[PDB]
Amino acid sequence: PSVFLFPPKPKDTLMISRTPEVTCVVVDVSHEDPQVKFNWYVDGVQVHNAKTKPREQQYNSTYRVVSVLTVLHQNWLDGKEYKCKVSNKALPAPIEKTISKAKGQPREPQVYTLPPSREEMTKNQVSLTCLVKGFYPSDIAVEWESNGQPENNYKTTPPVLDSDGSFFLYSKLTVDKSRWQQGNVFSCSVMHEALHNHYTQKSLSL
Amino acid sequence: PSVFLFPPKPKDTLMISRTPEVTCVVVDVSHEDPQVKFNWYVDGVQVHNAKTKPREQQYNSTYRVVSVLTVLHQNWLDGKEYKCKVSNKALPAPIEKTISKAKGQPREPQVYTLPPSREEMTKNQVSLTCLVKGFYPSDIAVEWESNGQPENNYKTTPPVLDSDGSFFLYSKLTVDKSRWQQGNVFSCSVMHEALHNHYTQKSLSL
Amino acid sequence: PSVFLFPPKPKDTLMISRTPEVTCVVVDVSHEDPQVKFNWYVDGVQVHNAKTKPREQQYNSTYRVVSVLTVLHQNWLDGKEYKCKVSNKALPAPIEKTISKAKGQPREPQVYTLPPSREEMTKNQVSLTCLVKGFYPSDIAVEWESNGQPENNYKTTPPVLDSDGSFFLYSKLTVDKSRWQQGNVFSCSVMHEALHNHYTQKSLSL
Amino acid sequence: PSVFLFPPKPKDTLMISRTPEVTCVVVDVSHEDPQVKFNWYVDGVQVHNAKTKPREQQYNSTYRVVSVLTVLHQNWLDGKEYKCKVSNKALPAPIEKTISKAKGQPREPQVYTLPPSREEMTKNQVSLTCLVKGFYPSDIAVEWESNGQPENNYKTTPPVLDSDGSFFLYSKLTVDKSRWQQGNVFSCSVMHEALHNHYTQKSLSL
Ligand SMILES: *[C@@H]1O[C@H](CO[C@H]2O[C@@H](C)[C@@H](O)[C@@H](O)[C@@H]2O)[C@@H](O[C@@H]2O[C@H](CO)[C@@H](O[C@@H]3O[C@H](CO[C@H]4O[C@H](CO)[C@@H](O)[C@H](O)[C@@H]4O[C@@H]4O[C@H](CO)[C@@H](O[C@H]5O[C@H](CO)[C@H](O)[C@H](O)[C@H]5O)[C@H](O)[C@H]4NC(C)=O)[C@@H](O)[C@H](O[C@H]4O[C@H](CO)[C@@H](O)[C@H](O)[C@@H]4O[C@@H]4O[C@H](CO)[C@@H](O)[C@H](O)[C@H]4NC(C)=O)[C@@H]3O)[C@H](O)[C@H]2NC(C)=O)[C@H](O)[C@H]1NC(C)=O
Ligand SMILES: *[C@@H]1O[C@H](CO[C@H]2O[C@@H](C)[C@@H](O)[C@@H](O)[C@@H]2O)[C@@H](O[C@@H]2O[C@H](CO)[C@@H](O[C@@H]3O[C@H](CO[C@H]4O[C@H](CO)[C@@H](O)[C@H](O)[C@@H]4O[C@@H]4O[C@H](CO)[C@@H](O[C@H]5O[C@H](CO)[C@H](O)[C@H](O)[C@H]5O)[C@H](O)[C@H]4NC(C)=O)[C@@H](O)[C@H](O[C@H]4O[C@H](CO)[C@@H](O)[C@H](O)[C@@H]4O[C@@H]4O[C@H](CO)[C@@H](O)[C@H](O)[C@H]4NC(C)=O)[C@@H]3O)[C@H](O)[C@H]2NC(C)=O)[C@H](O)[C@H]1NC(C)=O
Ligand SMILES: *[C@@H]1O[C@H](CO[C@H]2O[C@@H](C)[C@@H](O)[C@@H](O)[C@@H]2O)[C@@H](O[C@@H]2O[C@H](CO)[C@@H](O[C@H]3O[C@H](CO[C@H]4O[C@H](CO)[C@@H](O)[C@H](O)[C@@H]4O[C@H]4O[C@H](CO)[C@@H](O[C@H]5O[C@H](CO)[C@H](O)[C@H](O)[C@H]5O)[C@H](O)[C@H]4NC(C)=O)[C@@H](O)[C@H](O[C@H]4O[C@H](CO)[C@@H](O)[C@H](O)[C@@H]4O[C@@H]4O[C@H](CO)[C@@H](O)[C@H](O)[C@H]4NC(C)=O)[C@@H]3O)[C@H](O)[C@H]2NC(C)=O)[C@H](O)[C@H]1NC(C)=O
Ligand SMILES: *[C@@H]1O[C@H](CO[C@H]2O[C@@H](C)[C@@H](O)[C@@H](O)[C@@H]2O)[C@@H](O[C@@H]2O[C@H](CO)[C@@H](O[C@H]3O[C@H](CO[C@H]4O[C@H](CO)[C@@H](O)[C@H](O)[C@@H]4O[C@H]4O[C@H](CO)[C@@H](O[C@H]5O[C@H](CO)[C@H](O)[C@H](O)[C@H]5O)[C@H](O)[C@H]4NC(C)=O)[C@@H](O)[C@H](O[C@H]4O[C@H](CO)[C@@H](O)[C@H](O)[C@@H]4O[C@@H]4O[C@H](CO)[C@@H](O)[C@H](O)[C@H]4NC(C)=O)[C@@H]3O)[C@H](O)[C@H]2NC(C)=O)[C@H](O)[C@H]1NC(C)=O
């Protein structure tokens, strides 16, 4: 019987709108010793009931019981260590897996905007590109805006480790040629931990 | 013995960095019946221990006991009704004061930037002005940036009710003439509930 | 039982036609000790009967007795300290609340009128704005005139302290686009203590 | 006991000099039932001995037995389905995991090379970028050359699915400013299934 802690999705931490949650999961819960008793400790103080809220589930030939605890942004972004202390009878001595954003003197993500190669103009749909480099840690979200209104045709590579011990990632927003020539202004937003107001925006036009 | 609920400061709600808190206070707590027992209910479910955390305090010729409960942005911005149910013996039937951001189909704050009257150029320190109008509700924060770096010399009128049932407010950033002539770019940021990404920025230059 | 002194409205002080009055008010006057005896002292000499003139009034579960004393412009603008010395039997030692408007070197507000950001022109109703800065003390009132006739659509932020130890405040007069383009002449009037003839007017047009 | 099939590395498939191999691996092989009997079938006909060649290995508290089969370029690029049929006594009915790379009409990536945003020039190290889009299937590898000699400072995002059902990926080669200004010629090489000679190269310079 082994435990697994799950950090929250980025998007949900960086925004005041969402509810980011830390997830703890237990798999391989023997039919004979089905009792699992979760114990959550926030940094140090037990958050007891806090928000923990499981359910049981039959699976493989075993069980999978998942218990969830809500997290306060503030605390997370500030590194409060979150701890899961799960207990069973089959198990010998309760397992205690832990999890916190990975400490690490943050690096202010650099963000540039790059236009389509003359070459691409040859086709009926050009492609704009905004590289987001040298930031830390991975957590970060990118979104595109052509005005106040944000666009649809766009994807975002996940991050890769650079040599700096830094991070970088790209994002494409394919756009119908006309648009681009008709010199419209586009902007890719980058929300992250170190951006002064957890945000910065750049723009591409003609 | 009467109770008073206190909504959180704007700044602390709109940002993922801060810890916005709802404050409940009891004044006029008779020397003979000093026992006050707080009961907090979130929307409906009692948050029992949640985060409540008071202390007693001798004052006037009476007592003032303040108990505080932490609030999750999400929930607040979404209107969860927060309720304080205070009880004493002197008091007849516990008092139950409540409090939630004031419902009200929000209005996307319009934000413009205005330069100094030719007339002001006459002095050794000009003044830039960004009006923030027609938004709702009052909650909103304004900050100034000349580059990535944010400035110091600046104040922000509180809001006033307009005819629209809307709100508006101004903000000055006095700046040394040279600066202004040396065509530097300035920007006043407006963080609010309805701004797509809870933010928008405008700029003033030459 | 607690007393509250009320300085006169600005308009009423700065003009020779109005009668500006200082108001003293008593709240929570216990049904058993309803006797309240007003004692007015101007600067030093008791103004005894002067113009004091109350009446009694039953309220929530208490009484609220208001007594008023007329003030001479001259004396006020010159700083004569006005004092209210209220006495009751319930109360221990009569309360003596005082009131004079600000101490110090009044300063001449300098006023500028500013037009609507081109951007605002995009809408069906532009907005004119006249900042009134660097004045002392807060006392001051603003009024709008598009001709000899003054307008209606307009509000006035209260003052905020600046760094000069000075004061400033703004005022909006939203106006329907056409009229503004139709190059009409508008003026925001500023009545204050240090304006030569306790007034000054500026205008905005095309 | 569970089996895992491993497709060959791209470079090894697209080139006539390398030997690309499909790998089959068995984990959690119980100390009591350590007998694992590998059965390889190419597309349909069992390749019996073919080239299969394992060995046993003790691990955590279990065994991990890896057996490898060499693959003919031709057959692979043509889609021959490769199958691993592993059997043990502990296990109930042998596991048969399969593996062939993608089905469908491969598509010819179109490649563009893009320069660093003027803005980047502000720093001590610019960054070159060549987007590789609209290709199928994911299989593909990129390499950088500044001459005949290929560089080191560079990473390569994995692919992401686009809307065409196509694929695209980027690759950064940070380079010290001077060199870029010193107008040196750089080229990013793209080896893939549909590139005429399973290759194509583009260059960036001044
Ligand atoms: C009997 O059956 C059970 C389930 O049955 C499955 O069977 C298979 C065949 C399948 O086809 C289905 O039929 C069915 O799912 C078995 O349970 C499994 O038990 C495994 C252990 O034996 C366990 O392995 C771990 O898996 C980890 C990740 O697995 C992902 O993939 C699953 C399927 O795609 C998915 O369901 C999982 O949830 C998980 O994906 C991510 O899960 C998050 C939880 O919800 C989720 O988070 C969300 O959270 C917020 C909250 O609202 C919000 O929802 C967000 O959207 C979201 O972020 C993620 O989104 C979600 N992703 C997706 C795409 O949904 C894997 O990481 C583990 O790796 C570790 O184990 C190695 C092996 O021992 C170690 O060597 C490694 O070190 C590693 O752990 C390291 O930990 C270190 C510190 O913690 C790190 O430094 C290091 O980086 C880690 N290493 C790595 C490389 O990760 C591990 O393999 C399975 O997850 C579990 N399945 C499920 C679903 O529970 C059961 O075991 C069976 N019995 C047996 C024993 O055979
Ligand atoms: C014995 O002494 C006690 C204290 O002693 C005081 O004595 C005086 C003379 C003083 O000089 C000192 O010696 C000492 O302070 C007495 O206690 C007082 O009891 C009063 C009742 O008798 C009570 O009146 C209410 O006051 C409300 C606001 O008062 C502010 O001002 C205080 C002093 O400046 C300040 O300390 C208060 O805290 C409060 O200011 C704001 O307080 C928030 C609480 O901390 C604070 O919030 C923060 O929260 C976050 C959390 O971290 C973060 O900290 C943020 O930074 C921050 O936002 C605010 O910042 C803080 N502001 C500042 C500048 O710090 C007043 O609003 C009440 O008005 C209501 O009452 C009227 C009369 O009955 C009603 O008619 C009105 O309707 C009104 O209630 C309405 O409610 C509706 C719905 O709720 C609304 O629709 C409507 O808008 C409301 N109306 C209005 C106009 O408000 C009320 O007057 C005093 O506050 C209390 N003082 C203290 C400090 O507790 C005790 O009473 C004495 N015995 C007696 C009976 O004589
Ligand atoms: C009962 O009840 C009540 C409640 O109320 C309610 O009720 C109901 C039933 C009815 O009946 C009524 O009453 C109401 O509705 C009570 O009483 C109340 O309350 C209180 C007491 O407690 C008071 O006081 C408070 O508040 C205030 C405000 O007020 C104001 O406003 C209002 C509104 O509107 C009004 O009404 C009033 O009056 C005021 O004002 C006004 O008045 C004046 C005079 O008359 C005016 O003027 C006039 O005159 C002139 C001459 O020339 C001219 O003519 C003009 O035109 C006119 O008009 C003005 O203008 C007006 N305005 C308006 C608004 O309208 C406040 O202020 C206060 O406050 C205080 O406290 C706080 C806290 O503590 C603070 O903050 C502040 O500040 C103060 O104190 C102090 O002060 C100082 C100065 O600045 C400072 O510095 C310091 O610091 C402070 N301290 C502290 C602590 O802080 C208060 O609070 C009220 O008012 C009342 N109401 C009425 C009616 O009035 C009672 O009590 C009960 N009973 C029992 C329970 O006991
Ligand atoms: C014991 O323990 C262990 C743990 O671990 C650890 O430990 C230690 C002690 C040591 O010893 C070791 O082991 C380590 O460290 C265990 O085992 C383990 O774990 C597991 C089992 O459980 C496994 O598996 C998992 O993971 C995976 C990953 O893997 C990968 O990676 C890694 C890292 O590195 C490696 O190692 C491996 O191998 C892999 O890969 C690799 O390999 C291959 C082959 O060899 C390669 O290739 C090669 O070959 C070629 C030919 O030509 C060439 O030569 C090249 O060059 C070479 O290299 C490759 O490349 C490599 N790579 C790397 C990375 O390196 C994963 O994958 C898996 O996953 C799964 O599951 C999940 C969940 O479930 C999912 O998601 C996925 O997906 C999968 O499944 C499935 O799949 C499919 C496909 O896609 C899908 O669709 C589906 O959906 C799915 N399902 C689901 C549910 O979802 C897994 O998880 C591992 O691996 C191991 N490790 C090792 C060593 O390996 C055991 O178990 C224990 N015991 C007991 C307790 O029992």
3-state secondary structure chain A: CEEEEECCCCHHHHCCCCCCEEEEEEECCCCCCCCCECCEEECCEECCCCCCCCCCCECCCCEEEEEEEECCHHHHHCCCCEEEEEECCCCCCCEEEEECCCCCCCECCEECCECCCHHHHHCCEEEEECCEEEEECCCCEEEEECCCCECCCCEECCCEECCCCCEEECEEEEEEHHHHHCCCCEEEEEECCCCCCCCCEEEECC
Q: State the nearest Cα–Cα gap between C190 and chain B, in angstroms.
A: 17
Tell me the one-letter amino acid at D52: T
What residues in B contact C171, CB-CB < 8 Å?
A: none
Tell me the one-letter amino acid at D71: V
Neighbours of A, requiring at least 3 CB pairs below 8 Å, are B, D
Say if residues B189 and B201 touch (Cβ distance below 8 Å): yes
Q: Do D157 and A158 touch (CB under 8 A)?
A: yes
Domains and CATH numbers, chain D: 1-100 (2.60.40.10), 101-196 (2.60.40.10)
Q: Do A196 and B74 touch (CB under 8 A)?
A: no
Contacts of B117 (CB under 8 A, 6+ apart): C112, C113, C114
Alpha-carbon span A151 to B205, nearest angstrom: 28
Alpha-carbon span C85 to C46, nearest angstrom: 10
- End-to-end CA distance of chain C, in Å? 57
Q: Do B127 and C131 touch (CB under 8 A)?
A: yes
Q: What angle do CA C93, C99, C103 make, to 5 degrees?
A: 135
Answer whether the bond into residue D10 is a cis peptide, omega within 30°. no
Q: Does A45 touch chain B (CB under 8 A)?
A: no
CA D13 / ligand 1 centre spacing (Å): 31
A:148-177 residues touching chain B, CB 8 A cutoff: 148, 150
In this structure, chain C runs to a length of 206
What residues in A contact B17, CB-CB < 8 Å?
A: 73-74, 77, 198
> In this structure, what is the dihedral angle of CA atoms C102, C103, C108, C110, given to the nearest 10 degrees?
-50
Shortest CB distance from A113 goes to which of D112, D117, D160? Answer: D117
Say if residues C21 and C9 touch (Cβ distance below 8 Å): no
The structure was resolved to a resolution in Å of 4.1
Q: Which two tokens stand for residue C154?
A: 């307009």
Say if residues D23 and D30 touch (Cβ distance below 8 Å): no
The secondary element (H helix, E strand) that includes residue D177 is helix D177-181
Atom number in ligand 4 closest to CA D8: 52
Q: State the nearest Cα–Cα gap between A117 and chain D, in angstroms.
A: 6
Q: Which two tokens stand for residue A118?
A: 């003359």
Say if residues C52 and C38 touch (Cβ distance below 8 Å): yes
Ligand 2, atom 108, residue with closest C-alpha: B28
Which residue in C200, C199, C164, C205 sits closest to C184, CA to CA? C205
Tell me the one-letter amino acid at A95: I
Shortest CB distance from A168 goes to which of D112, D131, D172? Answer: D172
What residues in D contact A163, CB-CB < 8 Å?
A: 153, 174
Alpha-carbon span C193 to C138, nearest angstrom: 10
State the greatest distance between any 2 C-alpha atoms of chain C, in Å, as a whole number. 67
Contacts of D45 (CB under 8 A, 6+ apart): none
CA B66 / ligand 2 centre spacing (Å): 12
Say if residues B142 and B189 touch (Cβ distance below 8 Å): yes
Place of tokens 């992250």: A192
